[PDB]
Amino acid sequence: SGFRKMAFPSGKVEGCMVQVTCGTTTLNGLWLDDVVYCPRHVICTSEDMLNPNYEDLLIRKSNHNFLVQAGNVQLRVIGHSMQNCVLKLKVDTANPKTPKYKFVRIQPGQTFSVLACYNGSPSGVYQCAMRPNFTIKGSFLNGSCGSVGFNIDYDCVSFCYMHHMELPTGVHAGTDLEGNFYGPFVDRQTAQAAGTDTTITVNVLAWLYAAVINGDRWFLNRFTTTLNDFNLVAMKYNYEPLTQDHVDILGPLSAQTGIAVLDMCASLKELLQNGMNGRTILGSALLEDEFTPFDVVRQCSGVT
Amino acid sequence: SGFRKMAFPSGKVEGCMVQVTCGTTTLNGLWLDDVVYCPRHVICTSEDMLNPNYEDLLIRKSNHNFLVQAGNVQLRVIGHSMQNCVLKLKVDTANPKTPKYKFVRIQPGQTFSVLACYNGSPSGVYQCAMRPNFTIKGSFLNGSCGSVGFNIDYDCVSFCYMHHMELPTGVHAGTDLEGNFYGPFVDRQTAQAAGTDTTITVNVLAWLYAAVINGDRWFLNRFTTTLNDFNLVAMKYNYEPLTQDHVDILGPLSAQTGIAVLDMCASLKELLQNGMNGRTILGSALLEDEFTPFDVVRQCSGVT
Ligand SMILES: CN(C)c1ccc(N(Cc2cscn2)C(=O)Cn2nnc3ccccc32)cc1
C-alpha cells in the first residue's frame, strides 16, 4: 500500500549521459550507439539566442568544435548533422552502455521520468507529464539542456523528451528525440506564452482509483453522471474533455475496484463543485493529474 | 526554475539489487562487496510472522537454503549471520558494481530516495522522509521487502533504510543497514500503532524558501515572530518545535533570499492560522515537509 510520484529507475539513462561543449556553451547530450544527441542551441552564445539562424551558425562549426566528454574521457566526433532542433554528433565509439531503446513522440497527458543533468552528470530524477498546452513543469537550471525524459518497458528505454528551454513563466519546453518541439515553441529567446494549462481528467480519475485501492475512500459519493454531463462540469473547471477512449482505458481500474467509471466521474464532479473542505486524498490537498491509468496499474501491481 | 520532489539517480543502487529466496519466501537483498544484506524475515513463512523466534528459525537454515540471484545468475552463499533484524549472507563473489558506500542511521525529518524492488528488480524510485514518528510513507507491495533508502554525495552512496514492513495503517517501517529498526517497531505481525505524525517544521520553512526562489511569493507577509511565539503556534498545529539549530541550518536560504528565518516563521504562522484560501505554493495546496534545507540548496544549485 501507499502511492508515490514514482520515477523509473534511472540507471539505463545515466549510462548514456555525456557533456557536449561548443565554444563557450556546455550542455548535456544523450549517447546511444555511435550518436550523441543534443539541443542544436549548443552552437549559440547567449546573444545568438535572441534571433538565431541555426543553419548559418552551424556553417562556422566543424566536428572538432563539438567537445564530447563521457565521464572523464573525450569522444572523437567524426560527423555532425542537424535534424530539426537537435544535433546528431557521430562519434567513433558506440556507447558500450547503450540500452535497448526507441524514440517516441508522446501525446499530452502522458507521463515520463526526467533525469536532470548538468555537465553530463546526473543530479536527480523526477516524474512529470506532458501538459495539455505542451509544456512540462520540471526542475531545470541553466546547463540542464539536453537532459532527457523517458519511460521504460522492462529493458527498453523509450526516450520521449529532450530539454531545450524555460519560458519566461518558469515552465519548460523541449523536443522529442527527432528534434521536433512539443507544442508551438521555438528555440529562440523570444515572447512565447503557453496556452491554458488544463487538468488531465483521465489522470485525475486514475489517481482517484489509486486512492480507493490504497484506502482513501471518503470522496466516493452516491451519484453517477454521463460523459456529456460530466464534460459540462469539466469544461467549467478547465479539465480536459473525457472521451469514451478514456473510459475504456480506465476499464481495468474500474474492474479492480468495482466502481464504474461514470460513478467515479460523479465523485470527481462533486470534488470540483464542493472542493476538498480541508481534507486530503493520497496526502494531497489538490486533485493530482500526473499519473496515467497505466502508471496506477504499474505501481499498484509492482511491474519491474 | 521549477521545484520537484526529486530522487537521487538510482543507477548505483540498481547495480546492487539481488533476489533472496529462503524456502518459499522471496524478497530483495543489497549486495555490497561479498555480502548480501536482507531482512531476517526472509526465513519466515506468513504463519511464522505472527510470533517469530528468529534465532530458533535460523537454526533450521544453512548457507544452501539462501538462494541469491543477481540478474539471472546464482551467487554462492559461503556464510550467514544475523545482525539485529538483518541477515548478512557472505557470497563468494564481490559485487563488481559495488559503489563507494557508507551505512548511516538517519534522524527523523531527514529525506532519502527509495528504489522500490520486486524479485531483485528495480520498479521505481521516489523521494521520502523519515517521519518524526519513525515511519515512512512509501509505496511498497508484498515482495518489496529489502528495498533500500539512500542518499548520494557525489560518488558515495549512504544507505540509510531497508524496508521490512507495513503497519496495519498503511505506513511503513524498516531498519538501518545494521538491522536496527527506526522507532519502536518490531518485525512481528502484531498490534503496532504509530505515534503522531507531526510536520517537519524546518523542512516546511526550507520549502517556503524554495518557493520564494522559484517565484511563488504571495504568502510573504509583513510580520516577524520569535522562536518561542512561533513554537506556541507550531505545537497547536502538530508541527515539530523549531530550534536554534534549525534556524542555523536555514541560514544559507535566508542569505540567498534576504528573508530572515523568523520572518519566514511568521509567514508560516499566518499560513497555519489562515489556511491557503484555495491558493497553491509550488503546485501544492498543503505545506510540503519532505524537502530538507540541504535538498533545497542542492536542487536550486544543481549539485551532480
Ligand atoms: C546557448 N545559450 C547560452 C543559451 C542560453 C539560454 C537559453 N535559454 C533561454 C531561452 C531560450 S528560449 C527561452 N528562454 C534557456 O531557456 C535555457 N534553459 N533551459 N532551462 C533553463 C532553466 C533555467 C535557466 C535557463 C534554462 C538557451 C541557450
Ligand SMILES: CN(C)c1ccc(N(Cc2cscn2)C(=O)Cn2nnc3ccccc32)cc1
Ligand atoms: C516472510 N513473510 C511471508 C512475510 C509476510 C508478510 C510480512 N508483512 C506483514 C507484517 C509484518 S509486521 C506488520 N505487517 C509485511 O508487512 C511485509 N510487507 N512489507 N511491505 C508490504 C506492503 C504490502 C504488503 C506486505 C508488505 C512480512 C513477511
